[PDB]
Each structure stands twice: as structure tokens, then as C-alpha cells.
């Protein structure tokens, strides 16, 4: 790896600088380098890893959707050759590579070394997320296996989070948010999506009274995202 010669602490420092500069590809490469040092990640470091790759793949997903839309309309229309498909495939391949890179870090060896609920649920949610992004562009022999890999990762994260975390825990809340979107957008299960979002929201609401002002603000922010989706879906 090109980051093999840089100190772990320097990689983390530069990841934070890249975030300030909105240089998310750099941020991701720095955090990949930090993971490959082989030590477990702190809570702050896990969030840096997640922020970096979320922004990178977020840009690719947005680009893929633009190009897929153009491609779909070309198939309704004058023939303009292979270029739209070719370029959509280029972006798609780059997106799949980023997802594969993240899943590779989780499998070698973040998940197996993660024993606390807060780290294990975090990494399993990430595994579900990046299989979900693969599922968004999948159209082949393994779309179903990709979907089941996302579901399986989310399900394991859910089981742990329900046993080990309070209903207002932001990681638990963000996991349930994303699993409900998986149900609605990927798994063709809108009723499951709605049920999970409601139940998650209501159980968090009943636990808010236990929280500090600052934790209350953290939890209600994510609860509002559940509410926004319920309003869109119903």
C-alpha cells in the first residue's frame, strides 16, 4: 500500500485535514492506510472511515443515477451508439471497486476483531450499506445473493443492537433507518420498511427522558430522518 510508510497517527491527522478540505478521496485513502496498520479503530476513527467512503461512494452513486437515467431514455429515441452505456459501465465499475475495497477492509479484519457492541454493530451496518450500494447497480446472476448479503449483515447488526444498546443509541437508530431503506428500496418490502421505521421511532421516543440535552439532540436528529421517510412513504 502507498500508505505503508506513513505513521498511523499521521494518517489519522491527514484524514482530518482532508475532511476539512473536502478531499474525500484522499480522506478515504488515508483511513484505508490507517486500517491496514492492523490495530482496532477508536470510535472517532471509525467515524472518519465511514465519512470518507460515504462521500466517495455518494458522488459515484449520484453520477451513476444521472447516467442510468440518460441510458434508460435512450432505450425508449435516436440511436447515439455505445457511449452512454460505456460511460455508465465505467462509473459503475469504479463504484463497485470502492464498495469491494470497503467490504475487504471489514472482512480483513475489522469485523472479526470487533467485540464491543458499538464497534461490531457499526461495522456490520457498514457491511450492509456497501452491499446495498452494490445491489443498487446489480442486474445479473448474483443480484439476489448481493441482496441477501446486505440483509444478513443488517440482521446481525440489528440482533446485537437490540440486545446490547438502548433504543435511542444513534448507531442503533442509524442502522434501523438504513435497514428500513433497504426494505423499501432494495427488497420490495415497503410494509416492512414502514413497520421498522415506526417501531424504531416510537421506542426511541419513549426512552428520550433518560438522556442528557446533548444526547437528546443526537437521537432526535436521527429520529427526524425516520419521520421524514415515513412521511414520504405514507
Amino acid at each position: 500500500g502507498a500508505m505503508g510508510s506513513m505513521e498511523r497517527a499521521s494518517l489519522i491527522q491527514k484524514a482530518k485535514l482532508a475532511e476539512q478540505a473536502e478531499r474525500y478521496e484522499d480522506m478515504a485513502a488515508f483511513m484505508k492506510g490507517a486500517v491496514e496498520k492492523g490495530e482496532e479503530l477508536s470510535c472517532e476513527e471509525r467515524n472518519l472511515l465511514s465519512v470518507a467512503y460515504k462521500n466517495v461512494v455518494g458522488g459515484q452513486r449520484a453520477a451513476w443515477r444521472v447516467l442510468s437515467s440518460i441510458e434508460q431514455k435512450s432505450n425508449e429515441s435516436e440511436e447515439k451508439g455505445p457511449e452512454v452505456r460505456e460511460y455508465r459501465e465505467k462509473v459503475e465499475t469504479e463504484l463497485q471497486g470502492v464498495c469491494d475495497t470497503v467490504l475487504g477492509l471489514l472482512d480483513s479484519h475489522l469485523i472479526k476483531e470487533a467485540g464491543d457492541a458499538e464497534s461490531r454493530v457499526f461495522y456490520l451496518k457498514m457491511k450492509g450499506d456497501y452491499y446495498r450500494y452494490l445491489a443498487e447497480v446489480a442486474t445479473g446472476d448474483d443480484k439476489k445473493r448481493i441482496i441477501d448479503s446486505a440483509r444478513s449483515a443488517y440482521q446481525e447488526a440489528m440482533d446485537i443492537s437490540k440486545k446490547e444498546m438502548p433504543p435511542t443509541n444513534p448507531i442503533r437508530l442509524g442502522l434501523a433507518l438504513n435497514f428500513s431503506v433497504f426494505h423499501y428500496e432494495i427488497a420490495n418490502s415497503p410494509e416492512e420498511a414502514i413497520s421498522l421505521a415506526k417501531t424504531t421511532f416510537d421506542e426511541a421516543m419513549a426512552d428520550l427522558h433518560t438522556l442528557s440535552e446533548d444526547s437528546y439532540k443526537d437521537s432526535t436528529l436521527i429520529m427526524q430522518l425516520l419521520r421524514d421517510n415515513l412521511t414520504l412513504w405514507t
Partner: peptide, 6 residues
């Protein structure tokens, strides 16, 4: 679009 975690 459905919202996912920030």
C-alpha cells in the same frame, strides 16, 4: 429520495 444515515 429516502433518507439514510448521515
Amino acid at each position: 429520495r429516502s433518507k439514510t444515515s448521515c
